[PDB]
């Protein structure tokens, strides 16, 4: 129940990776589609391409997958100055040894130490029983390959029955005592406008 005016949302982005599918990036204001979902995280610089609809990848099959017939797209940019520290900030971390290919758009939160099966390691963290994640470093200076990039994934539904966001915009001026077409609130016609 609001309008998402992306004319300012794409903003003065230094580089907005608006690689979008299913719709032209400019023709969304006139669309009146259903509800939208918001979620975001941060990924190391090189594999920003590695996340995409339905291709292989360690980050893709273990932490976040994207459906093939996906409506929507993502935005990514650089936040090296705000995130990285001189000593290196160690707060960001991703799963390492998931024994499955997680389906797109499902919740998966867990902290138990991974076991390679076979023998019951039983929470000892010995052989074949490894603690996953292996958090990043985010060194104060490095190339674009392992540079912190802030990315947001955007997904909106369809079927148009629960009209949720939409947007009217495009408000023009007014004239009087002249023949002119009027579209005040959806109704259309031709005539002259005066007082009453």
């Amino acid at each position: 129940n609001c309008v998402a005016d992306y004319s300012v949302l794409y903003n003065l982005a230094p580089f907005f990776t608006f690689k979008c599918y299913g719709v032209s990036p400019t023709k969304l204001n006139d669309l009146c589609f259903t509800n939208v979902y918001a979620d975001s995280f941060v990924i190391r610089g090189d594999e920003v391409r590695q996340i995409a609809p339905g291709q292989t990848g360690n980050i893709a099959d273990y932490n976040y997958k994207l459906p093939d017939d996906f409506t929507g797209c993502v935005i990514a940019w650089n936040s090296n100055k705000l995130d990285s520290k001189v000593s290196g900030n160690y707060n960001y971390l991703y799963r390492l040894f998931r024994k499955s290919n997680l389906k797109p758009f499902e919740r998966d939160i867990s902290t138990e130490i991974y076991q390679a099966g076979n023998k019951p390691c039983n929470g000892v963290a010995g052989f074949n029983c490894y603690f996953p994640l292996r958090s990043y470093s985010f060194r104060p200076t490095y190339g674009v390959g392992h540079q912190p990039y802030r990315v947001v994934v955007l997904s909106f539904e369809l079927l148009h029955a629960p009209a949720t966001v939409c947007g009217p915009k495009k408000s023009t001026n007014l004239v009087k005592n002249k023949c002119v077409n009027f579209n005040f609130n959806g109704l259309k016609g031709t005539g002259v406008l005066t007082e009453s």
């Epitope: 290196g88 160690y90 867990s110 902290t111 138990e112 130490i113 603690f131 994640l133 292996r134 958090s135």
Partner: antibody
Framework: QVQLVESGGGVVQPGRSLRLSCAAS????????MHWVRQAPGKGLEWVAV????????YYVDSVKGRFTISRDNSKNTLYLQMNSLRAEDTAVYYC???????????????????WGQGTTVTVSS | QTVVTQEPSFSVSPGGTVTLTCGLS?????????PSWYQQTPGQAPRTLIY???TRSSGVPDRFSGSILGNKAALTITGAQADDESDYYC??????????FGGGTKLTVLG
Amino acid sequence: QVQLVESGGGVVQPGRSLRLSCAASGFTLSSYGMHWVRQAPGKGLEWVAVISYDGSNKYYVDSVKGRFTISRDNSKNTLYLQMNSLRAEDTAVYYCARGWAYWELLPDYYYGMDVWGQGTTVTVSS
Amino acid sequence: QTVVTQEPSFSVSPGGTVTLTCGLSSGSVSTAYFPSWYQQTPGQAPRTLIYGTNTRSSGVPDRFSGSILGNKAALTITGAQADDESDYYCVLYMGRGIVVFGGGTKLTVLG
């Protein structure tokens, strides 16, 4: 100012029950995680029990399973710990600790405890 | 069960450089386990010194610095003064509620 008041400590016969009381001033306990850590003379600190900011999950150490219960009161900004089946090894000084918050989104296995009150000592004697 | 190994006590002259070590005997220590360094003065409550493996608490002097050394958590202590001698603790985090502290180390100003 942020301060934690620990009351209810004392010396209790083994096998009885007591409710440790903790009052928070300056903030609301509903916004932060809370920790209970005990320390005995001649020993190091020993983790006992914690409560999350939301209270959806509760965790205890193996030595205290099935005997103690932790409860929180958001209305009066007061914290309670239930002690049952006390034994002589429980003679220690407990510190009520305040952890990080949902106000700063952190990953799972939440990082705990930065500031806490003076605490209160408890002894189990016959 | 996991046990954190710590050295009992050090003795270092004032103004010198010393480091404290905290590791795991059951495996390696990663930054995911979130090393933290806390100091306890007997008869009082501890103070928060080092968290985030590289960050100091509010009001903690920059003279204290910590990091990771191989599989052992390391804290760098340079320029010893009289008040730094006290008990010190290292904090490691396991999955979902298991946190294990070390054996405690009593730092001294040597003589």
